[PDB]
Amino acid sequence: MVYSYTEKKRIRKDFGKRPQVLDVPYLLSIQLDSFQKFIEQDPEGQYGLEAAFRSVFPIQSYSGNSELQYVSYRLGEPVFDVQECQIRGVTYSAPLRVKLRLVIYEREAPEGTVKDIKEQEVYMGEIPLMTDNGTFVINGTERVIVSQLHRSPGVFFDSDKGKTHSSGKVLYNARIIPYRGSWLDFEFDPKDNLFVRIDRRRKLPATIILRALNYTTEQILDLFFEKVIFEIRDNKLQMELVPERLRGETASFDIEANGKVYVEKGRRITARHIRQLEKDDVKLIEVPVEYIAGKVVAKDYIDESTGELICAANMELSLDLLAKLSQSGHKRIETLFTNDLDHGPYISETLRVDPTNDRLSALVEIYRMMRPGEPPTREAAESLFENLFFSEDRYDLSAVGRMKFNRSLLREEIEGSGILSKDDIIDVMKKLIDIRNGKGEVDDIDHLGNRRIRSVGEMAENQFRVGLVRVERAVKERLSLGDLDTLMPQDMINAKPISAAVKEFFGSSQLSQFMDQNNPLSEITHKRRISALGPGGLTRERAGFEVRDVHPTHYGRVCPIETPEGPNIGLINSLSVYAQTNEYGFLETPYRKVTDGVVTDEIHYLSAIEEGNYVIAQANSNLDEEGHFVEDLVTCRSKGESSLFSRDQVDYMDVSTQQVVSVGASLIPFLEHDDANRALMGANMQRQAVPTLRADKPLVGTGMERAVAVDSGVTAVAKRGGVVQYVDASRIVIKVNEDEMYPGEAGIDIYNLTKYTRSNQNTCINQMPCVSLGEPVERGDVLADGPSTDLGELALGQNMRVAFMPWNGYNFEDSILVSERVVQEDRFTTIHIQELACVSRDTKLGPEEITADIPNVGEAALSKLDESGIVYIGAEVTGGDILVGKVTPKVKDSSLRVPNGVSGTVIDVQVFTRDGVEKDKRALEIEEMQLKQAKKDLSEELQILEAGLFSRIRAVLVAGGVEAEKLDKLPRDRWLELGLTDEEKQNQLEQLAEQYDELKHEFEKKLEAKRRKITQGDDLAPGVLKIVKVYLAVKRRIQPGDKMAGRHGNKGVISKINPIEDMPYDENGTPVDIVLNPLGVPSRMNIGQILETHLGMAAKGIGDKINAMLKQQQEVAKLREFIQRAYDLGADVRQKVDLSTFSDEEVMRLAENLRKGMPIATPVFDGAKEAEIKELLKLGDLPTSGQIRLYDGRTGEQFERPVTVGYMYMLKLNHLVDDKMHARSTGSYSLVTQQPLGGKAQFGGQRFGEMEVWALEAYGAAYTLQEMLTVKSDDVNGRTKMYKNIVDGNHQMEPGMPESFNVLLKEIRSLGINIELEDE
Amino acid sequence: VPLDGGRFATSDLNDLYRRVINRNNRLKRLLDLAAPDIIVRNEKRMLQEAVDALLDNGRRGRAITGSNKRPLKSLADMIKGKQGRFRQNLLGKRVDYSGRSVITVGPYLRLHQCGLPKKMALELFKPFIYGKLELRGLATTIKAAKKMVEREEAVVWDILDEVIREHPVLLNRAPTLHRLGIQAFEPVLIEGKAIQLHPLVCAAYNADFDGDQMAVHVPLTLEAQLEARALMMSTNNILSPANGEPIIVPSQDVVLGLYYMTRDCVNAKGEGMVLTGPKEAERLYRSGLASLHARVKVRITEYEKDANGELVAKTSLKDTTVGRAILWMIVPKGLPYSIVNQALGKKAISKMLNTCYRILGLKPTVIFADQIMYTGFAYAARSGASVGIDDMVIPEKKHEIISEAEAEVAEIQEQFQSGLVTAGERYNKVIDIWAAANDRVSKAMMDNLQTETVINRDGQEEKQVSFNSIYMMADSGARGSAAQIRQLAGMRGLMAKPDGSIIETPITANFREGLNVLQYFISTHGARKGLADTALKTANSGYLTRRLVDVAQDLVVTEDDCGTHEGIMMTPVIEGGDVKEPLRDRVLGRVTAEDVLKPGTADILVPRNTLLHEQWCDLLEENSVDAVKVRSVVSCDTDFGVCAHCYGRDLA
DNA sequence: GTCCTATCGATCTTCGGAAGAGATTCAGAG
DNA sequence: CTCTGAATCTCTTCCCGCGCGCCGTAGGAC
Ligand SMILES: [Zn+2]
């Protein structure tokens, strides 16, 4: 085992047992790998913009006799990178350029073109791009598009009991759902009549489709029914008997011949009867005419002489009909098999309901019912029918849709065309009829084998296709009417439809979620989020328990714990840890390939449908280190059912115990001991924690942090191995070792760490370094810790020392008692960065100005303002201070005053100004500062690179004519022709000299371009001239009313900041920080937080022993002696660490990083048992009970009986009180109705709902109601007269009449209604 | 209205009127120019459809829109609807002089007080402060008074402390299903920003303090203040209007303290001595010479009010515990000692409090409740009843009970392996055997929990009730009933599929032990089913409430006696064999319909129109009366109202 | 560029609501 | 031949607050 340098600082003790055979994959690959499939061109045009184009192009005008065809598309590089684009507020996108080849053919000649015009990649639109963190920048705002989950295209069969007519019976209905086209549903009437409908239109007979498919009633009957034959030879009407057709049914009539009678009238038929009959050659048998009368014929049979219909398809025969038709010369009669249980007449029943006759009749009826108000026509009914289900423009089964369809039809082949075929619909109907006969099973709609996941690279593709369809619609007409001679492909198309479509999708779609950048965990769990909502899906208000409830196939693919409880439980899901999306779009999960009696180290991915065909061993099964199941019989799940199976019968095994959970639940320790409700609450709350100021580490984790913090994209990660050369908390420069250095490149890699920057939740996301100058790093190591991360491990909150006890009721049932020490240590203080903008527009009366010469203001408020009229950076401000000196023409004192309540430090001011208007002085100063910084950055880059390059040149010049005097004589730049033989060293020198010249020119051009960009007058788009941005930093501490929470679903607002004296202290004098309530533990069944607390105590105890051994100058050999014992303790744990190889330098470093408690890992379902917790407590001098006796600080008495004390990891949730406390006396009033405004950002009052009115009426309070609904809110005249009296001290109201009511009257008086007040 | 920049916000009605005006002007222009009949007919149809879109947009074939398929709101749309005027601005309207904040529990408050932040008090009582600044003469007018208030001058805080002296504030939590969700409180200034709420009141609001926001409204006029103090004050709402049940039922933490204080142990420090009075007993505890659960003889004195209503003092020696003798110093001077001579729990205490309201009255009852809360909190803090993994006990026989029970299922499987049983019978035998095993496991676990305590009384071991933390939490009724401790220490038991089928293989583990992956996945079914049930039923409940209020809003008690003599006969509910509720519950608080007869013949017992209060209910239960006809609101013959005699007792 | 008129006056607006209530048709029904 | 059945049509309805946060006339003629 080898430990990486980032890992080789805190060797977290692990209590796992199973060896993790497959490491957790990249957690954001769900996004990128999808968008990667989108932007990349592919000769297999499918899955990309090339697929979208081929689905549209080539496009031709039939009247025009000329086409234009797509050639290729090349994507221009983004104009602005992520940082600049976010700062300025533009979108991060790329320009799309498409080669269109306009070919003009010639009339009276073959398609030999007169001329073809290939446009050089004409501009087509701007498509947004996915940043490497997996997010899109649309308007500076950073967005994440959730992957959607919906029903896969194909055919689905469903039936219900009670929901339809309640009469015991179930109605079977089949649906055909194309990927893009019209729905087609077949259904059975309660009287077994089969009908069809399109897009849930009116019911139409099913057979009409076959009439549309040009099938005669004879053809249909032959397709669907079986033939039973009667002959008029050797006897009157003998029957061809098929003995298997008679089984179970009572033989209700005589059948006897050839000696022995098989079955007489009135008896059933069994197998031995069938065998006797088969021996009897029952090809012809005697039946009475009555049995022959009940049949229905299969074919038309006309009078051969007169040529008139004597029998027709589906015509029911009778004795006289039989005699007549046989006399006419049709001696071989064929009838339909119509066994009630087996061969129902459903198609014939539809025939009886059919009012149509033939293909013309079918088309007429289809046209009339499809388009009321539209007259049918032979040439147009085809234009409707073919477009319905056979034309590519309005029908296309996707590849996955066709695969699922063929699977549903048990076809041998899955590669089929997207358009339906006659045999396809015939097979669908046949399966439907078989299901009606009961020879099949209905599918499950909410089964993961029927619902597939659409991601960004598919929804964006569909939106692009919609845009291209609109563009084709326009340009087909343009080419039909265009002269085709002066036209060029740029004239044919305009970007506007495509640009608008993609822009709307990426800006305001239902799935273009605004990112909740509260912390790295929120980012990851939002990027891997799965939604059943959105277009083409269901809605939060029209879904029932069926789709919400969990499913036996969710195992290994969807987290059953992390769902947003509330309005949309079960509709928004989080993808499991190991799950990945199949090629077709389904979710597949890896299972260990179990071979015979051994569990191999071979991972095969199984989908939701394949999993039923196997038997899967649970991941908790033990193996004998040879791969064999130690248990003779092992519990396994086969078809949703789970039960025991014998060894060497199982076929697969889950790859890890964490395969069932998601990252949010994976981070929670002791998840096995928590009731699922509290697990859900903890998982939901963990992503709401605000990044504290000094987040350090969790004492008890699950080891998932080492991945969640790395893959979040918020921590600076070493791209290549090397040695650190310089760090200044802003830029970490690494000397990447030559083993991975490009021969011509710099060989030195910068890392410009991001400092305090506002997040989507108004939090700071600065990254701080953790490596030291000269420290070696390897590729993938975390260099700089981001927010909520420290030393490469995710750390949302702080580990507080908590005790479980009632304390005078200040922890009453949700409340939390917090010692003053934790607020003295700045345990929970956090920075909030608010952004306030002061805009200025070129109004109709003249252009506005920003100036310190504002009218009607004294120098008191101007003290913070500068000579230009903007606050000096670093000035501390409070609510009401002027931050911007704007003036409006014709003058008015419109200026940005700080919003009430908030107060903090102004740390940034960016002023974006539209040019033409002169720039204010401070804008000039800020621009000059930016330009100086950019020039300094570029110059430092070039000069450090020049130093490295010149040093390399001198190193090359060491061998090959080294001359120290001639080398240090001249400046290093005049080394063009230094003394060196006619070898390849001079060639390397010339190569590096050309490289240096290229670096010179690149430095020059980049500097000039950057200067032009910064000096550019920023585009203030809608009639606006200048905007000034201000950023305020508020260092919010923790106060009563703030909300804290554990990881085990325990939450509550802190009720008192108890001073240090009043807190309980143990016999060592150490006071506890937080006093929790015990009664909440047994009620909500979240016992996990208890055990963790106990373990946490031991986790600190080890540290308490190390710190002393560090405080006391122990010799390292002894120190190591202790630490190794703390690591080798436990069962046969998976992790094994030998501290000997640490050379005592890494030992001392680890101790310096361990003296604050040894971090411990407790995997989700492979966690530490109580025995190991007791053993670890025994290693320290701590009590093995877990409970200690405490002393009340106020009275010095000892609490009766010991109490539980430990270190619980607590998180400050983002629901602090100062964002929610509000009160209104008098202020803004709404216009249409004079009721007060509503909200916090507006000075509004609380809404007095109808329930409150009912409650007031429940008491006898009438004056209270009258005041509350007339004076306080509605009566404009009254609420002033009340104001005067209250100031005057009269306390009397004049109610009048609520103005809103009068408005209602006008709304009714605006109609043809005369409603008015009355006197008497 | 304009928006940011030189543009005006789109108005729905304006566009409909514009369409109508344009179409009508076109029709007028044509009719002036004599357009052909076809054209004028088409214009008239378009005008009619435009008027249709203006009036009730949506009743047309398709609503018109000027955006991404967002139909325009019409006049009829604005009139009705959940966002319409009726339910948006008339029935419920936003009110000035109100605010909201996150609440927190202040145990020091009296029953009739609540703490509010100084900032919120200043921002709600602003005009009242002005009303003093002029009256004090400290400010010239409003112009200087507002400035001084902004200056937050230290004198302004004195003005606030004078204004807020006796001015009630209304507190209501959203939602407010019943009238007890809105109450008046006398405010007290608090430094912080959270609203200090009383513990005993939090039950009425259903207020968990896990970040729960709550709103305050300031009654301004004189009549509003008086109405708040007389009808909505906390101390005026001690009985629930839905049934004769107090709403000040002792909280979860307080009852734990009382249960811990009054419990008795076999052998304890300070046992068996004689105490001259309750006060001395307290001293002993605070000097540390005696244990709270020690058994002792203290001289008790109690007062009993005669039939006329004057207290009679009686003093005696009583065998009791030190905790009970200490608590007796709080119980008012009208109750028997037998109420406190027992280990009190959330049930046993409640009737106690109720008995006070039955005897002493409202004013003694409220102070007694406050003292009970104080004592409970203090002695629960002294208890330190922590909870730990050591307290969850797994009975040792459990492994055997499983090892046998599964084997029995094997036998039921063996029959299925031999064809000796049907498919369904195997299922319904296995599930029943598992249920019996679960019952055995639960009984063994409970027996072990209570038996885990055995103590030596000067010689030989003797068992007693268990001081186990979980056991005291469950037995006191605070939290964690038997179904909780059974899942925490017995076995989780059977589960159900989303289709409701009983799982053949129960969750044989308990949360103290680890649940495996499959067991947790099985539990997720029931967890999500319950969560979805809550999220879906929270809407139907509210809709039913709205229907009820809008069907019954008219009825008011508007007359004393209607004079009728009919009614409805009340009998105990006897169904499924034994009775499910007594006669007293039905008939208490109503008036008799006719003269109540003695059990037998020709002898009456109660007058024909007498209210059957508690004493007469006891008198009836003394006799063998099962059917009693009493007047009912349905039968009362009062026009456009309901007579008072039919409705009877006001339950609050 | 400004400012205009008009609003699928050559499409297909979504199929993942349930129910509950009338209102409106039809159907043997004499 | 309609009457007095069902059956098949359309319309109405769906808890309370509270916060974020974006997003918000269009194409065509002088
Ligand atoms: Zn009455």
Quote the tokens at residue A516.
């909740």
A871 CA → ligand 1 middle, Å = 76
Task: Name residue A316's amino acid.
Answer: E
Question: Does the distance separating the beta carbons of A1022 and B193 come in below 8 Å?
Answer: no
Taking the C1' atom of every nucleotide in all shown strands and the CA of A183, the nearest one is C15
Quote the tokens at residue B52.
């249709």
Q: Which residues from 1217-1246 of A have any strand D atom under 7 Å from their CB?
A: 1219-1220, 1222, 1238-1241, 1244, 1246
A1266 CA → ligand 1 middle, Å = 30
Is B208 annotated for ligand binding?
A: yes
Is B306 annotated for ligand binding?
A: no
Alpha-helical (H) ranges within B453-516 are 469-475, 482-489
Express the helix, strand and coil content of chain B in percent, nearest 5 each. Answer: 45, 15, 40
Q: How many angstroms separate the Cα of B49 from the Cα of each of A1134, B24, B39, B438, B534?
A: 77, 11, 15, 71, 45
Question: Does the distance separating the beta carbons of A1271 and B97 come in below 8 Å?
Answer: no
B599 CA → ligand 1 middle, Å = 27
Taking the C1' atom of every nucleotide in all shown strands and the CA of B26, the nearest one is C6
User: Residue A290 and residue A277: Cα distance in Å, rounded?
Assistant: 22
Classify burial at A171, counting beta carbons within 10 Å of its beta carbon; exposed 0-12, middle 13-18, buried 19 or more: middle
Q: Of A366, A418, A1, whose CA–CA distance to A177 is shortest?
A: A418
Question: Does the distance separating the beta carbons of B127 and A675 come in below 8 Å?
Answer: no
CA of B541 to C1' of D13 (A): 14
Task: Give me the residue from A674, A807, A1300 closest to B89, CB to CB.
Answer: A1300
Question: What is chain A's length?
Answer: 1320
Closest residue, by C-alpha, to the C1' of C15:
A199
Q: Of B321, B338, B234, whose CA–CA distance to B285 is shortest?
A: B321
Task: Give me the residue from B86, B127, B469 closest to A1283, CB to CB.
Answer: B127
Q: What residues have CB less than 8 Å from A208, skipping those under 6 apart?
A: A196, A354, A356, A362, A365, A366
What is the extent of the structural domain holding B511?
397-534
Q: What residues have CB less than 8 Å from A580, skipping those under 6 apart?
A: A25, A29, A30, A587, A588, A589, A590, A605
Instruction: Count Cβ–Cβ pairs < 8 Å, chain A vs chain B.
Output: 447
C-beta separation of A479 from A68 below 8 A:
yes
A201 touches strand D (CB under 7 A): no
Question: Does the distance separating the beta carbons of A560 and B524 come in below 8 Å?
Answer: yes
Which of A 1003-1062 lie inside 8 A of B, CB atoms? 1022-1024, 1039-1041, 1043, 1051-1055
Angle made by CA atoms A695, A696, A700, in degrees to the nearest 5: 115
Taking the C1' atom of every nucleotide in all shown strands and the CA of A476, the nearest one is C10
User: Residue A392 and residue A385: Cα distance in Å, rounded?
Assistant: 12
Question: Does the distance separating the beta carbons of A1051 and B524 come in below 8 Å?
Answer: no
The pair phi, psi for residue A1258, each rounded to 5°, is: -65, -40
Question: Does the distance separating the beta carbons of B93 and A1247 come in below 8 Å?
Answer: yes
> Strand (E) positions, A809-966?
816-819, 830-843, 846-847, 849-850, 876-878, 882-884, 886-887, 896-897, 903-913
CA of A997 to C1' of C12 (A): 63
Give the determination technique. cryo-EM
Nearest Cα of chain B lies from the Cα of A674 at a distance, in angstroms, of 7
Angle made by CA atoms A309, A311, A317, in degrees to the nearest 5: 155
Interface probe with A: pick from B94, B120, B346, most Cβ of A within 10 Å = B94
Q: How many angstroms separate the Cα of A1057 from the Cα of each of A802, A815, A1039?
A: 14, 12, 7
Taking the C1' atom of every nucleotide in all shown strands and the CA of A370, the nearest one is C12
B83 touches strand D (CB under 7 A): no
Task: Name residue A965's amino acid.
Answer: E
Cis peptide bond N-terminal to A1183, omega within 30:
no
In chain B, which residues have their Cβ closer than 8 Å to the Cβ of A812?
A: 105, 107, 199, 202, 209, 251, 253
C-beta separation of B86 from A1205 below 8 A:
no
Alpha-helical (H) ranges within A294-377 are 319-328, 346-353, 359-370
Question: Does the distance separating the beta carbons of A1077 and B253 come in below 8 Å?
Answer: yes
- CA dihedral angle for residue B243, residue B244, residue B245, residue B247, rounded to 10 degrees: 80
Task: Name residue B584's amino acid.
Answer: R
Q: Which residues from 449-468 of B have any strand D atom under 7 Å from their CB?
A: none
Task: Give me the residue from B85, B202, B380 closest to A1304, CB to CB.
Answer: B85
Is B265 annotated for ligand binding?
A: no
Question: Does the distance separating the beta carbons of A1186 and B390 come in below 8 Å?
Answer: yes
Cis peptide bond N-terminal to A564, omega within 30:
no
Nearest Cα of chain A lies from the Cα of B327 at a distance, in angstroms, of 17
User: Residue A730 and residue A718: Cα distance in Å, rounded?
Assistant: 15
Whose tokens are 């809709």? That residue is B543
Q: Of B187, B174, B229, whose CA–CA distance to B237 is shortest?
A: B229
Q: Which residues pair with A95 in a beta bridge?
A: A126
Q: What residues have CB less than 8 Å from A167, skipping those under 6 apart?
A: none
Number of Cβ within 10 Å of residue A1216's Cβ equals 24
Quote the tokens at residue B149.
């208030």
Q: Which residues from 278-307 of B have any strand D atom under 7 Å from their CB?
A: none
b/e A928-960 (16+ beta carbons within 10 angstroms → b) = eebeeebeeebeebbebbbeebeeebeebbeeb
- CA dihedral angle for residue A9, residue A10, residue A11, residue A15, rounded to 10 degrees: -170
C-beta separation of A1280 from B142 below 8 A:
no
User: Residue A524 and residue A796: Cα distance in Å, rounded?
Assistant: 14
For chain A, list the domains and their CATH numbers: 26-152+445-575 (no CATH), 153-225+344-444 (3.90.1110.10), 226-343 (no CATH), 576-656 (2.30.150.10), 657-713+789-828+1037-1220 (2.40.270.10), 714-788 (2.40.50.100), 829-917+1018-1036 (2.40.50.150), 918-1017 (6.10.140.1670), 1235-1320 (no CATH)
Task: Give me the residue from A550, A1224, A1259 closest to B96, CB to CB.
Answer: A1224
In chain A, which residues have their Cβ closer than 8 Å to the Cβ of B233?
A: none
Quote the tokens at residue B314.
């009686």
Q: Quick one: closest CA in A to B129, which residue?
A: A1287
Which of A 789-828 lie inside 8 A of B, CB atoms? 803-810, 812-815
Q: What residues have CB less than 8 Å from A506, skipping those under 6 apart?
A: A91, A128, A136, A138, A143, A145, A460, A512
Question: Does the distance separating the beta carbons of A1204 and B516 come in below 8 Å?
Answer: no
> What is the 8-class DSSP label of residue A1039?
-
Q: What region, left, alpha or beta, does residue A444 occupy, with left being phi > 0 and alpha being psi -120 to 50 degrees? A: beta
Q: Of A1249, A1293, A1301, A1254, whose CA–CA distance to A1272 is shortest?
A: A1293
Quote the tokens at residue B71.
């139909």
Classify burial at A601, counting beta carbons within 10 Å of its beta carbon; exposed 0-12, middle 13-18, buried 19 or more: exposed
Using the Cβ of A1243 and the Cβ atoms of chain B, whether some distance falls under 8 Å is answered with: no
User: Residue A1248 and residue B89: Cα distance in Å, rounded?
Assistant: 10
Question: Does the distance separating the beta carbons of A1268 and B388 come in below 8 Å?
Answer: no
Q: How many angstroms separate the Cα of A1208 from the Cα of each of A522, A803, A1045, A1094, B48?
A: 22, 9, 10, 9, 72
> What is the 8-class DSSP label of residue A1044?
E
Q: How far is CA A76 from the centre of its chain?
A: 28
CATH number, domain with residue B512:
1.10.132.30
DSSP string, B324-375: HHHHTTTS-TTS-GGGTSS---TTHHHHHHHHHHHHT-HHHHHHHHHHHHHH
B566 CA → ligand 1 middle, Å = 9
Resolution in A: 3.1
Q: Quick one: closest CA in B to A681, which residue?
A: B531
Nearest Cα of chain A lies from the Cα of B324 at a distance, in angstroms, of 18
User: Residue A139 and residue A650: Cα distance in Å, rounded?
Assistant: 54
Is B562 annotated for ligand binding?
A: yes
User: Residue A931 and residue A1013: Cα distance in Å, rounded?
Assistant: 10
Q: Which residues pair with A1052 in a beta bridge?
A: A1044
Protein CB footprint (7 Å) on chain C nucleotides: 6-10, 12-19
Local structure of A370: helix, strand or coil: helix
Q: Quick one: closest CA in B to A1244, which residue?
A: B96
CA atoms within 13 A on the CB side of A602: 9
B60 touches strand D (CB under 7 A): no
In chain B, which residues have their Cβ closer than 8 Å to the Cβ of A1246?
A: 94-95, 98-100, 215, 217
C-beta separation of A73 from A96 below 8 A:
yes
> What is the 8-class DSSP label of residue B230?
I
Classify burial at B378, counting beta carbons within 10 Å of its beta carbon; exposed 0-12, middle 13-18, buried 19 or more: middle
